[model samples]
Every structure is written in structure tokens, then in C-alpha cells.
Target: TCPFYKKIPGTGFTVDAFQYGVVEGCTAYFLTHFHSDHYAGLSKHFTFPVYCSEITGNLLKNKLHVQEQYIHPLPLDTECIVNGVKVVLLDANHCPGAVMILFYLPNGTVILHTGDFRADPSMERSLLADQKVHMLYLDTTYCSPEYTFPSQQEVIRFAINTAFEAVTLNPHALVVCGTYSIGKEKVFLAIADVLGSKVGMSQEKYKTLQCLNIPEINSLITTDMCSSLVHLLPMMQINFKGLQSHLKKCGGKYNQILAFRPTGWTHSNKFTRIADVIPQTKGNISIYGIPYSEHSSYLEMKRFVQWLKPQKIIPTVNVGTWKSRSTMEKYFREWKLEAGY
Candidate 1:
């Protein structure tokens, strides 16, 4: 059974946060990424030493105020011994500093915990060339067949072109781009590169971006609505009520406001292809949900399973009627049987 603390059987390692707070028996604590859902309940008060990627470690220290000594930054593709277990990290392709933890247990078992990631073909040579995975902790966020989407590269191109076209069509309008604080920097970075202008962000987000130290991102922290030609707002800040409030606060300073949301949720019904760009007007704001995701789609998950052929599969998320463990097991069984694994 999946519990709040994802403890490895016969090991002293715990993945992410739990209700009990710190697992006293754990030799080391592993954080897959910096997403709030994964790191919820973690705070400066944490006691255990945390293992994560360099970027994740930096964020944990700088953003969350975790002490530097307790944070151990592991370089990707390198092996290190931690609490009697051999551990290696791999690129997750989900967000900055996201990584898949591969553990070489003493019992000769290999457990791969994919934090939240889309399968990148480049990983095949590094991961599947000779290694065998015994157990897999998967990120099943987009496991349903209906959640297919194009690659990030393709979607980034589409978003840049679409945003440019929207701005060109409405020259007098201010472009508002919405994305997650860390995940969709590629989309906004591409937008900045294409538009030849610096993206404006709130002070909080600007500080967060500084942690990434991306050279392509030329940005400024702004409180004014019209401080920059393009405003980069967090996805949660671009909702109907939020944008309506923003427009009212702006007092018709700009002719119009065109918003774009780059996320996986845009694949919901009416969008058949990944290239499809759909618009939803909320009040006076014309918002477009562009299909971009950092998680693997259903077909991609199947391919990943076939390549790894693990002895067991456990989805990281265990919630809701449609996504219970029984449902995940049934789907995995079907895929396993089809692949003759």
C-alpha cells in the first residue's frame, strides 16, 4: 500500500515529504523536484539532510530557506554511495533540477523513481543501453489515453509563433503570458527571444528565475501593468477573476490584453492535435491555452514501460476514483501483456 511516506522496502530512504514530517529512521531524504505538491509541508524547520539536484538544492536553500549544509546536491549521471546504497541521478526533463532517482539496493534490486518527467529519446542510450530496472515509481499525471501532446520543442515553436501573431494582430494590446513558476521557462524564454524584448515578472518570480541563471532570460521585476510590452504571469494568476481584477486595476491603460497559457490541461476535449491553439475569452481578456507539458503522455508512458520492463509499476499519484492503484494496475497489466513482458 502507498503511504504518505514513500519508504523503500528494506532501505532507510524516504522520498519527498510525509505526514510524520521527517522519518527518523531514514538515512537520507530524497526530493525529486521543487514543485509544491512534492515538497508540501517541508520548511526551514526540517531536520533531515536532503538529497536533490543542484538547481533543486539551490532553490531549497535560497527560496525555501533550508540550511545549506542539510542540502546535498547530486550531479546527474553520477553514482554516489549514500547510507550503504549506491545511488545515481538522471535528467527528468520535467523542469529545472528535476531528476529521476535510481537506487542500487544491497539486495541486487534496482528501483527507479521518476519524479515528474517526459521521456526524452536521448535518455535511451544513457538509461536503457544495458541497465535493468526492478521497480518503477512513475509519474502518472497524464497516463490517460486522452492526454497526448506534442514534444516540448514543437509546442515551444507554436507558442512563440502564436504569441507573436496575436501581438501583431493587436498592436495596441499588452501580451500576458502565463506559465508555472519553474516548469515552462522554455516557452517564455522562447517568447522573449522571438519578440526581442525582456519579459516582465513580479518580484517574487524574478527572484525565482534568477536562481536558474539562464542567460537567455532578460527580465525585469515590475509592479505596473504596462511596465513591459509582454508580462509574464504565473498560470494561477491568469484566471478569469484574476485577469478581470487586473484589467480593472489597470484602468484601460492599454487598448487590450491578450493572454496565453502554455500547459498540458489544454489537451482537454475539442483539441485533437498537439498543434491546435484554442482561445477562451474571459471577460475582456482573450486567453489562449497552448498545449505544452513537462510530463509524459499516455503513449510515451507505454513506450517507457516497454523499454524498462520493470518487475512492478507504482504510480506516484494515488488519488481519485479514476486514478486509484487498482486502475493503474489494470492499465499496466494490459500494457505489459500487449508488450509480452
Candidate 2:
């Protein structure tokens, strides 16, 4: 829908823009995270060198079956000279293996591509704030004032507390968690830590989780069914009908079902707060939807742009329509003026 989104302007670089096919004057391809929307259209058919974090690289080969020879994994917090261009990867804090890319072109332009991220305070300590960025390619998923949510830690804590109450009441309650391919492991880890239980999922997902090399997860994950009352399943499987089927499959061993699902679509607004959005319950099942977002909230986005003070702003998401695109530009204009840089 946007031609400018297909590749970096003034350079032969494509960052997570594979769906548009090959762009003219493109040299290298970069992926920031393994999310479906970002990695769409990439496959075993891709021939050029695709660069990303080591974990993302592993998922590409193990899940997507992209050729091993073409995958280039960059180390976090280290600089690498890629075809004479200075490149560095910083932990994005969005998901496991996600990174924000820093590029120093031969012409001395500093460009930062924040693939997708949560605005963490640690980012200020890194080289990101040490130097002025000439151009900024931002993740603007929740760039509008109407779309705001609590911090990831706040949401994760809420989920853990909510899950704990149900489990404490009925120790034999079946716990079901909803997730995508490679995000929100933090939520489940917190749940297991609080309840003193292991996590159960399919062998395929277990294998993918292992690639991230996350802390405390190696000892807590298992493929054996029912070995864990807390089970992780795909997001689509978190509904009432889905819960009923799983409980019956266990065959009356568990009395009730407690489910937890997280997404960024849930938000804090002018009218409501995170706590005000209550869980949906039906008979024996209660589904808790927490705003465990990987993307930045509207206020967080504003803070980042004000602090970084990039010379030019480029929104990576929500550029598909006049309303969103115009709204983004308006926000950028206001922020830049407020920042006074």
C-alpha cells in the first residue's frame, strides 16, 4: 500500500519489507523480529542474505525453512561491519530475539530502525542516545492518543495475580495460556514462578522457545501432556469452546478452566483503565485478556521521540490510510515542537 515502506529511502536496504517483492537498488535485507506481519512473504525461496538476531535466524531456518547459507545472525550489543557499513543490534525488549538496528552509513548518516519495541529505560544507557540519529524508522502500532495501555510489567503482574487467585482456590484447575509464535513468554514465566509449576506445550513450540535462550525457561518447559496443569496454546484456542474441548480431553481430572490471553489491541483510554476491563466468564471458564503488548504505547512513543530527537521521522506501521498517516504526522509535528530540538 505504501511504496516508501518497501525500502529505506536514499539507500539500497530493505528492512522487513519482503512482501512487496524485490525493490530496485536494494542490497541487503534485515529482519527485526519473527512476528508474522514483519516476516510475511519471506521463505525458503529467498536468495539474498537476510540478517537478524541469532534467535530470529534460528527460527527462520527451524520454522520457516529458509536456507541456512543465506541467514546472517548478528550479536546483540556488538558492532559488525556489514559490507563496510557499521551495524549494531540492541535488545528491543519487545520479545525474545527482537532487536533495534543501528546503521552508520558510509556517508556518516546515523539511522535507527526500531523494528518493534517497548520503551525501556535501559535504552538510554546504550549508544542509541549517545549519538544523534539522522533518520528514525519507528514502530507506530499505537501511535494515536486514543490507543494507550499500561506498561508490560504492569500487565504481566496483573495476569499473574489474576491467574494465582483461581489456581489457589482450586489447585487442580486447568490453566491455559494463549501466545503467538515467539512473544509473551515473560507472562507465562511470571505465572509459573508465582504458582511454582512447569509450563506445558507442544514439542514444536518447545523447540522454538529453546532457541531464545531465555532465563529459567529451560527448567520449566516440558512436552509431556498433563505433566503441567498450566498449558500454553495458540491464541485462537483460548475461547470457551476451545477450553471445553481441552477439559473434556483430560476427562474430568480438572474441575474448571482458567484461561489467560494477551494482546496490544486492549487499551487504556480517556474513559477506561486497565483494571476496569474485567475478565469474561461463563459457567466453568473465565478468560482473562491482559494488554501484554510488545509495541510501544502512545505516551511511550511520544517520550522516545522527544528524548531521541531524530532529525526526520518515519513511521513503520499504521501508514496504510490517510487517517492514520496524517494523524502520525500531526503527532510527530507536535512532539518535535514540544521537544524543541
Candidate 3:
């Protein structure tokens, strides 16, 4: 929802902006990943040359139907000259096809744009080994003292074990995993493999996986509801009331609906670890809102900025309103001070 996600300051560039209709002075467009927020403004008819990962490129053509000439797919950990700018795409560690763009400007400015990423150990080694980044455009969605969630490994293992047990006890319980366009595939894909159950989705999402191409997932997903015990739908349809009606519509084939809702928002500061995360229930439905976060946490974000020690740190999310923006800036300053800068 924040407009800052699309624009890169002091450059003739806009990352993941399309609806603005050829932003003035914008020579290049970059997409971090295939999520709707980043890809919101894009369309097939746009004129600007779009730059992004190869997987994102395929999604643009197959999913959004964007023209192939306009889409430029860049490989991870590789540097190439686009026009006159030195560009490098590092693995973002957020979702499939996500990349953190490193720009070496003509004026000798180094800018690091983390589209949407989870801070990993390899990232610090790769980015800060020899470069002194002049500017860092960060994904500050969960950049706060309060948000300290568990790792993806912990959340995935927990979700898989929990889902495996729920269905093992009650084989008739319909398993439902909520997801957006592409980010949460890792969670449900593991669930399908562990449960030995095929995931049922609408035609649209099934086509989405063809672009995702995580692995030999062709055997894991299908359009037929009759053949699948698990329903993989958008987060919208995973609600309790919706599941209740969905259960009734299934003609008693499933006795209960066991669902998992994975997001950083679900994480509470009170929960010190993944074991403390609880599930919400409604009669015959049990919904687990696990702390499956992709963004860096308070500590993770702080550690990264201090380690990189960029001359300036810019946030994408939570920067629209002046009050919230100013508040976030204070935290950025606080982190920079800890780095003795």
C-alpha cells in the first residue's frame, strides 16, 4: 500500500511500478518479486523495459501476459550493465525469483535495494565483503523492536508436524493452506509432500505454479477437488465462515477443516518462540496463524543495517504517513548510532 515501494530516490528508476503510466524521468523499471504489491502497476501494454529475475519474467508473460520484449530477466549473483548503470541481482531469500538489486551508479554511488527479503548470513558476507554501500533501500515491513519471529525453518517444521498430526488423527478432516500469489508456496508444498496429499487449487493458482516451478510439483497440485484432501486457496477464502460453507458444499466428504494461516502479523511479541504460537478455533474448524515471516525481524534488521552500515537507510513500507515515517526514521538513526556512525 505504500507508494515508496515503487520509487528509488535520486535515480531515473522505479522498481515495481506500472500503474503510474511511465513515471517521468524513469529510464528503468525493476520488479523484486511476483507479489501483487510490487507488481501492482504493471500491464502488458507498458512501454518501459522491465528488469527482474527469470522466474518473475516468466510470470509476467504467463501470468500477467506482459510483452516479452519489455521484460528483461536477470540472473541471481550476476552483474550486468543495463544502459550505463552497473547492476547486480543477489538472491533475496524472501520468495521465488526475489532479488536484492545492487546498483553502482555512474556517479560512483552504491545503492542496495532489498525488494522484500529475509536477512540471511550469506547476505552479509556477499554484500559487505568489499563494498561500502552509499544507500540502502530496505523492506521495513517488520522493522521494529516488537516483531521478533522465528526462522522459516522452525515455522515450516512446526506447521508440517502439526498438519501431519491433525490429519493423521482425523483422515476426513480437510486440510486448507492459505496463500497469496506466490510467497507461501514453500510452506504448503512441504505439507503436501509430508501428508502425501495432493493440493487442490483454482485454475488460476495451478497456472501460477507452472511459473513458480519449484520442483517436480506437477504431481503435487491439481484442479480437481475430488482428488485432493487439501484445498490451497487465496488467504481470502481461508476464513472460518468460508470454511464452514465450504465444508457443507463438500457434501460431508470432509468432517472438519484444519487450516494454516502463515504471516508475520500473526506473531505476537509475547510469543518468545514458535512453540508458543497458538491456533484459533470455531466449532469444527481450527486455524493456525503461525509466525511464518519472510521479512527481517527487529534484531535481524538492526543487525543487517549495522553490519552493512550504509551511508543512508531508506524504508519502503510504513513510510507513507509523515508521523509513522518520522517514527521509523528515529529507529533507523538509533540502529546507526549502535554501529558507531
Candidate 4:
């Protein structure tokens, strides 16, 4: 299991993930995110070729150690065929290489599958306006009323503020923030952008940013110029392990702190709740929790379902099983559309 899995109950995806071998009925799979729920079956059972953005392909190859030949890379907004179904990939400003997939079939019905997207003001209108989606497979992981997450722009602001505060509080203290090396590369880029002339990135991460071809954002230091990551230089680290030892070696000298800025919805909530009840620190250490999430909340899901307004709701995984099984008793319900194991 990955760090995050099955937080939401009664969702079909959670149980379906436990299956072994390739899914039976899915003619093709358009994976939108690299998170566990989406890719849990990849290394285990999936043998079918995957279609993805070029950036996503590179990220998967570099990070997860997956094979490149299995990928059929496409750029954002570009249309391509996957097992004969047309698909359009769009920028999903979530984790690294995350995307929103629009599956267009020849039959005229369109399926919009949004993996884990934080609503981007710039891209939201274009995504909803460009297509007529008959069925929408939503990222329902956070589709519950209990969530209230800050905007992405606000999260960037919060991150910058926290970074400045961390530096001010202890110039030499090691600040650790959690983010996957790939998806949150932009956030790190933002951090490095603020670092200015002192900015540095690993040789590997810099090349990845280029593969992503992100637009100019306050001028991040290119990986080509930097020799190594700051994590190795006793300044800051993205990994908690490296940060912990750095603190221990310094002997708790400079108001040492362990801070967490929320990356996605689930982990952020869990960390913050624990932080609130726990005391600050005993050994010159400090920790901060900045709430940030990328997936749509319950409100987002409602908006999608209301907007698309599919004629008939055909749930996938097990829901399809019961729905089809019950319907087959009275009439001829085509069982081809149901997802298989």
C-alpha cells in the first residue's frame, strides 16, 4: 500500500483496487493521476499499454521505475487514440504530471474523467466549455461535505510565507516539507524561485521540469546550473529522513523545527489534526501545518454531476455488477460497459 489509500468508505474504487491481474472488461484505461487509487493495479496486474502525457510518461519512468515502452505519450490538449477511443489530456494542477482526461468515443458519448484536480481559474472554463460530456467519472475521493480546502494560489502564498518565516525563525535550521518528487516539483520550483541566485535543483529534477515545459513562473533556477539539491547542503530538504538527521547533528542548536505544508486533501487533514492536539516542541524544534489539497471537494463533485447531467448513471466496479445483474432480470441490458477484473 502507498502512504495514502482507502480513506473513503463505500466507494467502489477502494475495493476494486485489491483485485489481481488485469481488469477484464475495460478495453482501455486512461489513468489520470499517479496516486495509489489510480495506479494501484499498474505494477501488480496491468499489462495493457497506457496512454499518458509526455511529462507524465517521463515522471513515471523516472520516479516509479516503470518501463517507458509501455507508455504512449501525448501532450496536453492533444487528441489521440487509445484502443480506438479518442482521448484529450488537459493540465490538472495537482501532483506532478497529473491530468484531466476527456474520453471521446466514436458513438458520440463523451466521458470526462477528472483524476485529482484543484480547480485552476485559468483552465477551468476551457475544460468545461470545450466538450459535451455524457458521463463523468469524477475524483470522488474528497467528495464529502466535511472538506474545506484553500485555493492553489492561496497555498502558494502560504508556502512562501511559511518559507520566509522558517528562514527568519532559524536561518540554519533544517525545514522539511513533504511532497512527491514529481508532482509537487512546481511547488519546489516556486521555492527555488524565491531562493533566487542561491537557488539549486538536482540534475535530475531540473531535466524533469523541462520535460514538463511549464510556463515562466517568477524565474525558477534551471537544473542545468545547479550542481545538487539543497537537501544535501545542510539548508533544506524535501525528505523528512534527511531533515531529521540534519537536526540531530546540529544538536538542536537553532530553534529546529519540523513543518508540514499540505499537498493533497487526505494527508493534509490527518497531519493537521495531529498537529493541533500535540504540543509544539521540546528541543528547539517547531512544526507548522498549512492546509492544502488538490482534489475536488464534495461541492466540486456536485457541481460536475449537476452540470453534465448524464441521462443514466451507470456506476463502475461493483455497482455496475449489481445494477446490471438486477436489470438483466427484466430486460436486455448490454453488459459490455461494465468494468472487469
lDDT of each: 0.77, 0.84, 0.82, 0.52
Clashes of 2: 0
lDDT value, residue 94 of candidate 1: 89
TM-score of each: 0.89, 0.94, 0.92, 0.66
Candidate 4 versus the native: TM-score?
Answer: 0.66
Q: Order the candidates by TM-score, highest first — what do you get?
A: 2, 3, 1, 4
- Among the numbered candidates, top TM-score falls to 2
Q: In terms of lDDT, which candidate is stronger, 1 or 2? A: 2
1-341 per-residue lDDT for model 1 (tens digits): 23743777778888875446656677788999888888877778787779999889889888999888788998888889988889989988888889999988898989898888898667778754578888898888877777767777877877788778867887667777886658887776677567766677777887788777565444433444455667877678787777777666656666677787876755363456655556788555788777777888888888888878899887886545664667778889999899888
Q: Under the 3 Å rule for N, CA and C atoms, how many clashes does model 3 have?
A: 2
Clashing pairs in 2: none
lDDT of 2 by residue, 234-294 (tens): 8898999988888898867898888888776653445667677677899989897777778
Residue range 64-147, candidate 4, lDDT tens digits: 666766766787877776555566888877776788777666767776656666654455466567656665544545544566
- Give the range of the ten consecutive residues with the poorest summed lDDT in model 4: 7-16
| Per-residue accuracy of model 3 over 1-341 as CA lDDT, tens digit each | 32665666667778877767657778888888988877887777777888998999999999888999999988777779987777899988888899999888888888889989988777777845777889898888877677777778888899889888998999998888888767867788888888887889899888888887577778888999888888887788888888887889787798989998877655364655677666789898999888777788878888878888888877888876898788789998888777798
Clash-forming residue pairs, model 4:
24-340, 95-183, 96-183, 256-284, 256-285, 257-286
